[PDB]
């Protein structure tokens, strides 16, 4: 409920359109940066668009980018994802 952000992104990595894919790739590669980024920052980092970040979040069943960041942060809190 406050976790699973990385699992949900990794699950869809190969089922996402291009613009959403660039985003999922950057977040998976740099999840610590991702949880401290704005929509404008993450879209620039993934060479994608602001609209694609919102679409990515909706594609995953999330309320938006804050939800995505919270759920990723929840995973980074776990020993399962620490290291």
List the helices and strands and how they pair.
Layout: H1 5-12, H2 18-29, H3 31-34, H4 39-45, H5 50-59, H6 65-77
Description:
The protein is globular. The chain has helices at 5-12, 18-29, 31-34, 39-45, 50-59, 65-77. It has 83 residues and is an all-alpha fold. α2 crosses α5. The chain has one domain: Arc Repressor Mutant, subunit A (Orthogonal Bundle), CATH 1.10.10.10. The longest helix has 13 residues, at 65-77. Residues 39-58 bind DNA. Residues 3-79 form the HTH rpiR-type domain.
- State Rg: 11 Å
Determine the structural class based on helices, strands and strand pairing: mainly alpha
CATH superfamily: Winged helix-like DNA-binding domain superfamily/Winged helix DNA-binding domain
| Element-level helix/strand string | HHHHHH
Integer count of domains:
1
How many strands appear in the DSSP assignment?
A: 0
What share of the residues lie within helices? 55-70%
Which fold name corresponds to the CATH topology? Arc Repressor Mutant, subunit A
CA-to-CA gap between the ends? 23 Å
| Name of the CATH first level | Mainly Alpha
Strand count, sense and barrel status of the largest sheet are: none
Can you name the CATH architecture?
Orthogonal Bundle
Percentage of residues in DSSP E strands: under 5%
- Count of helix runs: 6
- Envelope shape: globular
PDB class: transcription
Keywords: APC85504, putative transcriptional regulator ybbH, structural genomics, midwest center for structural genomics
Assembly: monomeric
Entry title: Structural Genomics, the crystal structure of the N-terminal domain of the putative transcriptional regulator ybbH from Bacillus subtilis subsp. subtilis str. 168.
């Amino acid at each position: 409920m406050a976790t699973g952000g990385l699992a949900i992104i990794q699950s869809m990595k190969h089922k996402l359109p291009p613009s959403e894919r660039k985003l999922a790739d950057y977040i998976l590669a740099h999840p610590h940066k991702a949880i401290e980024s704005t929509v404008n920052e993450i879209s620039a980092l993934a060479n994608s668009s602001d609209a694609a970040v919102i679409r990515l979040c909706k594609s995953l069943g999330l309320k938006g980018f804050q939800d995505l960041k919270m759920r990723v942060a929840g995973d980074l809190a776990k020993p399962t994802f620490q290291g």
